[PDB]
Amino acid sequence: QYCVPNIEQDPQILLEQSLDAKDWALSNGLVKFVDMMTQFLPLSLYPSPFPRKLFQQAVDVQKAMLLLYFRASCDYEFLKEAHKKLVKRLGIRQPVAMFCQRADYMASQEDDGQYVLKQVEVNTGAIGSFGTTPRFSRLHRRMVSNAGIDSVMPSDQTDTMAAETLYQAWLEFGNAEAVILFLHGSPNSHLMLESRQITHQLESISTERIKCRFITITEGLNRLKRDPNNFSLILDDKFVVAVVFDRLMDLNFVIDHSTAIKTPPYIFALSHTKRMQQVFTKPGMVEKFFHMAEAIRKVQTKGWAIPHRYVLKNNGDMFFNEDILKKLKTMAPADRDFYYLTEKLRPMVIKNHFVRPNMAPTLNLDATPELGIFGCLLGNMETGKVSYFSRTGHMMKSKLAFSVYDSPYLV
Amino acid sequence: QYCVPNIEQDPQILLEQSLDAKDWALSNGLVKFVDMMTQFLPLSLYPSPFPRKLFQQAVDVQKAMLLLYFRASCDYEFLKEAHGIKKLVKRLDGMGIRQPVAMFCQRADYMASQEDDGQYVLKQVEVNTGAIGSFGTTPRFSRLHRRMVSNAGIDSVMPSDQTDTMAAETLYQAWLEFGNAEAVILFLHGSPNSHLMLESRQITHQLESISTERIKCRFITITEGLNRLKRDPNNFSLILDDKFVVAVVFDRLMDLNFVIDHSTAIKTPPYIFALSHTKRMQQVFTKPGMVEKFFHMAEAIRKVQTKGWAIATENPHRYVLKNNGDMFFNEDILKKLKTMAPADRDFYYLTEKLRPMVIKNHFVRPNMAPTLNLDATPELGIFGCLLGNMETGKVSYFSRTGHMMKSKLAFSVYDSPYLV
Ligand SMILES: [Mg+2]
């Protein structure tokens, strides 16, 4: 069976492959801004092994997972019932929402010793790793291939996926002269290069020369206004904005209550609290929006509202072992409504090598991988109908048993 | 006709396109090590205009240009007769030849020069070999600028360059001529963070995808090479870590250097070529007969030469007093001629100063605002490689040609030609 130590154990060769991997990263956009310069993103040298069945189980449930959170997001009454500054803020001026999600998974060791797929988190909005993912995927196919080893390292085109979904959003807005807005926190934001890499894909999947305009949120106070008649969002008094691609406040809701397609609109932030994820583990709550429901139940982890088997988590800081009893007695009952109890997962431990900026590589570490599955929707929130499902994507992150980008090798 | 100002003159839009161009560079290896981190390479925002005929004239003469310097390099007595240079001769004299097969890659540089009618002619500024810059950077700038131009609606006028591939294809052919399946290719650098390092790595990314059997490329600094490289006393083959035979030593920038040079590894190129690429020699090739001797390819070469006279008094601004391997202009040329001691006379020559083509472009630099609507003078570099046997003087392989451009103010910037 594939495992990373049995590829190579000469330290001098592993060191030389570290420098090679790192120099490939520096040559292919696997970088971030620091200080302002660029630095490569920490990476595992080789792809970590991962069960084929569970990866397929995670990939297959993504369609269902988007549909559940999309439909929950179309039912504001439901979301409110499941739980204050966000509610205060929240007819609809743009029914069409673009909705991209990353579901995270851990292969978890049940008793018997066999691994089962269990979902760690769902994320939407200012999502990391659209641009980095297809590149790490290529990095690791190259390392593996260069060492002689071998469908077991599945293709990821997640930069393309994002591009194809933005293009479809632009088309649904239906204005040939309209632009796509990339809204960042700063010029050197940690999302900036992933954002730019999305546009490099958008260019090569169109004739149309779609203008993408990169603006910070500070400069947006002067350069974005809303039309008082159309309620359309305008840039520099001249350009209609078809899509606002949020890449990380009064302005934010002025944008949200306008005809531009949001990615996704603010209502989705309410449907992706950890409270809500915990609420979906209660009986009936998935079935309500729907088989896709059973597939979803298989990956859930029962979480109970208000000791080494459990974790006390906050719902939006967490306690393990005897600290759970310590915090339970200590805690005032006002705070009880902000935490929940879940079963602690026994995570799969594998061996790999870790390559970091300005340090020697760490060889033969125990690490636990975490699988992220990407998927996007284009849907209408007044009808609840979906018009577009994007291709799926997938990435991985390993931490010691601070993290590292990785990619799965399907054992 | 194409010119850069008539693309766009909104400063806010030019600024936004600067950041875009720069972020594309950071995403595609147009970077170097600094400080240790990475920084993007300064670039022109748009490709600078360049005459179609002269570019074709430069591309077409490259085959001839490699053949002349290759054949001059096969004739040690000729090179000696044409003359640090004392230190290089001393060495070559210690060495028969253990590896006849040389790999020979050249970059010839050109300026479009304004003759008196007002029309531009191609004139060669320099030839370079050995630790050559811009193998890896060139195809990427080429792609950068095709993208900027295309994204702005403008349009064979921006010719494809695969110079990373070119280098790879020539190393692969060198490895094959050595003929040992278990032999490695050595990349010799000055340091781990050398300015050539990422261009070197990018060559290997191309070498991987033009073969099935993974050729091992081993990256070593020259300091580490003192412990890890020895020569076999029987084969005279160069060995790495007592285990790996080295088929090709790819020099990317001293006793060790000539221990490597006098061994069976293919050099890139061997040290003799450093003697044939002095500026003295380039100046010697401008004298009558000296090109014709190795050869029409000769006339093509004569067209791009600039007469240079060894060691005026009416239009001294037409001339420059250059060093042959620091230079004097205008009335200083007459001043320094009389002043100068005859020891120094053998290290300088007189050439015609070229009146260079000035174009407008925008310059994008790290951590500053872009400089819009500068006058700049572009400089065209044509790449080509050989694989040849120096005992017979026969060539077995000619690589594809490549091309790059660099613009300076009328500090420099990577550019690419738009063929007006
Ligand atoms: Mg004068």
Residue numbers in the entry:
A (entry chain A): 34 to 68, 82 to 129, 142 to 148, 155 to 214, 218 to 315, 324 to 365, 372 to 387, 405 to 414, ...
B (entry chain B): 34 to 68, 82 to 129, 140 to 151, 155 to 214, 218 to 315, 324 to 365, 372 to 387, 401 to 414, ...
The authors write:
To explore the catalytic capacity of nematode GS-like genes, the G. pallida representative of Clade 1 (Gpa-gss1), one representative from Clade 2 (Gpa-gss5) and a number from Clade 3 (Gpa-gss12, Gpa-gss17, Gpa-gss22, Gpa-gss24 and Gpa-gss30) were heterologously expressed in, and their proteins purified from, bacteria. Remarkably, each stage of the evolutionary process that gave rise to GS-like effectors has witnessed at least a 10-fold reduction in apparent glutathione synthetic rate, such that Clade 3 GS-like proteins have not retained canonical enzyme activity. In contrast, none of the Clade 3 GS-like effectors accepted any of the tested terminal amino acid substrates in combination with the γ-EC backbone. One possible explanation for this is that Clade 3 GS-like effectors represent a novel diversification at the site of the di-peptide acceptor. However, the glutamate of the di-peptide is exclusively coordinated by interactions with charged side chains of residues in the binding pocket (R, E, 2xQ, N, and Y). All six of these positions are substituted in Gpa-GSS22 and Gpa-GSS30, thus suggesting that the lack of canonical activity is because γ-EC is not accepted despite the potential for cysteine to be accommodated. Variability in the glutamate portion of the di-peptide binding pocket is ubiquitous in G. pallida Clade 3 GS: of the 24 GS-like effectors there are 21 different amino acid compositions in these 6 positions, not one of which is canonical. Coupled with the high degree of conservation in the ATP-binding pocket, the functioning ATP-grasp fold, and the perfect conservation of a catalytic residue, these data support the hypothesis that the loss of canonical glutathione synthetic activity is associated with a gain of non-canonical activity.
Glutathione, the tri-peptide γ-L-glutamyl-cysteinyl-glycine, is the main low molecular weight thiol antioxidant in both plant and animal cells, often present at millimolar concentrations in vivo. It is synthesised in a two-step, ATP-dependent, process: glutamate-cysteine ligase (GCL) catalyses the formation of γ-glutamylcysteine (γ-EC) from glutamate and cysteine, followed by the addition of glycine by glutathione synthetase (GS) to form glutathione. Cyst nematodes have exploited a series of gene gain events to redeploy glutathione synthetase-like enzymes during parasitism, within the syncytial feeding cell formed in the host root. The most recent expansion has been coupled with a diversification of structure and biochemical function that has given rise to enzymes that are introduced into the host cell, and likely possess novel substrate specificities.
